[PDB]
Amino acid sequence: VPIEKLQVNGITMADVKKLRESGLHTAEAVAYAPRKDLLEIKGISEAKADKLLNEAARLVPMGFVTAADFHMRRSELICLTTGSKNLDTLLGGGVETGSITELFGEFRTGKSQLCHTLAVTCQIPLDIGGGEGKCLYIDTEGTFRPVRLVSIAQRFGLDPDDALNNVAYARAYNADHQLRLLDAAAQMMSESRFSLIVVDSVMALYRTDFSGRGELSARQMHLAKFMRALQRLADQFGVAVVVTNQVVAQVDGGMAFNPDPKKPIGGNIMAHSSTTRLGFKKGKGCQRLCKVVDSPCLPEAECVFAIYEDGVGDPREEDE
Template sequence: MSVSVMSAALSTATTVQVTQQALEEEDIGPTLIKKLEGNGITAGDIKKLEEAGYHTVESIAYTPKKNLTTIKGISEAKADKLLSEAAKLIPLGFTTATDFFQKRSEIIQLTTGSKELDRLLGGGIETGSITEIFGEFRTGKTQLCHTLAVTCQLPIDQNGAEGKCLYIDTEGTFRPERLVAIADRYKLIGTDVLDNVAYARAFNVAYARA
C-alpha cells in the first residue's frame, strides 16, 4: 500500500498531488508531453505515447530508444525524433553549479504537521518531485495526505506553499471533515481550505489515467 505526493502514482492506496504557483512556471516541475507536438510529431503520436504510459517530456527524454520502439506505431525514426525534440526541452548535459543552485533554491518544503517527521525528511516534503509513503494498514498514511492537503495552503513562512491541492483518492478514504479539523489546528478558515482542494475518486488505474 503506498501514497504518492506531487504526482498521480496510479498504484497507490491514496494519492495527493500538491500544486502551487511556483510549479506552474515553465522551468519547474514536469513538462506535459503535449509540448512535443509539432516538428514531425503528431497528435496521434502523442496519443500513442500517453496510451503507453508516457505523460511527460521527461519520461520520453529518460527512456532508451529501444523501449520507445516497442510502442505500437512508433518506428525507430520516430523514436529518434521524439528523443531529439525531448532533448531540446529537457537539459540532459552539464549545467553550472550556479544554475543548479538556483533551481534548488526554488524548491519549497511542505510541513507534514510533525516536527520530528519534518526533521527526518530534511525539512519536509519537497515540491517538484514525488514522495512515496508506504507502510502497514492504519499507520497514518491517509492522515498524512489529509494534513498535506491543508499545509500546502499555509504561507511559505509557516512551511507551506500558498498553493492548492489535487487529491486523487483510490480507496474512498477521503474525508473533508478531517480537512476542516486540520485547518482549525492551523487557524485557517475551513471553507476556504475546502475550496482549495480539488477531489477525484479513482476506481482503477485506467480511470485514474483518464
C-alpha cells in the same frame, strides 16, 4: 513543458494524440521514455521515434552539470510543513518535493491523519510552508474521511468548500486499477497544477491479489513497475509523493539483536525504491513516536508528535 512544443519537423497531431492516449503527456515523459516503449506504440516508425527523441533531447537538458549549480538549485526546493515543529526539525523543513517518502508502522499510529494534514496543508501559501496546489488522493482501504479535512482546514483558516473542491479523490479495487489510475492522475496534473500525491496503502491489494511462492516474483515485479512509474511521475511534475505501508511480525526470532520484531511489507524492492523512510510507534495518550530509518542526508533520530481534533501537532504540556 507542454507536449505541443513537439509539433515541429513533420510531427503530425495524430502522433501527439496517440502519445497522449499512450499515457505520455509532457515532453519530459517522452525524453525519459526509452526507445523500446516508443516502438511499442502503434503507428510509430523508427525514424519518427528517433526524430521525437532528438526533439525532446533538444528541449530538455540531459548533460553533465557541476555540483555547485545542482546544490544552489536544490536549495530553492519547496518543503511542505506537517503542522508539527518537531517533524519539521527532524525532516529539515518538512517533506521534500521530488522524492518518495514512506511511512510505516502498526495500526492506530496516525499515518492517515498525517496524510490528511499534508493534503490540507498543500494549499496554504508558501510563506507559511505550503505548496499552493491541488492534492490527489488514492485510497486502497476505504478510510478517507472528509470531516478531518474540514476540521483541519478550519484550523488553518481556509474555506472548507474551496479546500474540499481543490482535493481530488479516487479509490482502487485491485492492483491493475491502482496502476491504471496513474494515467488519469498524470493527465490531470498536466491539465492543472498539483503539488502532492498520497497513496494509502501501497501493499494492501498485493497481499491478496497474488498467491503463493509461485506468484511472488510477479507481485514483486508489478510493485517495482508501480514504484518506477511513481518516481517517473514525481520527477516529471515535481510534486511530493507520500506512501503508507503496513508491517509484519517476523516469526523467526534468530535476529534477537533488533528489539522490534515488526518490519515493513514489500521487502527489498520497497526498501530500495523509497527515498526516505519513517517508522511510527504509539506512545501514551495521543502522543506518537516518529523515527527516521533511511535518509540520504538526515541523521537517525526520534521525535514526539500528538494528534488532536485539529490534526497533527506538537505535544502539549498537558500530555506531559
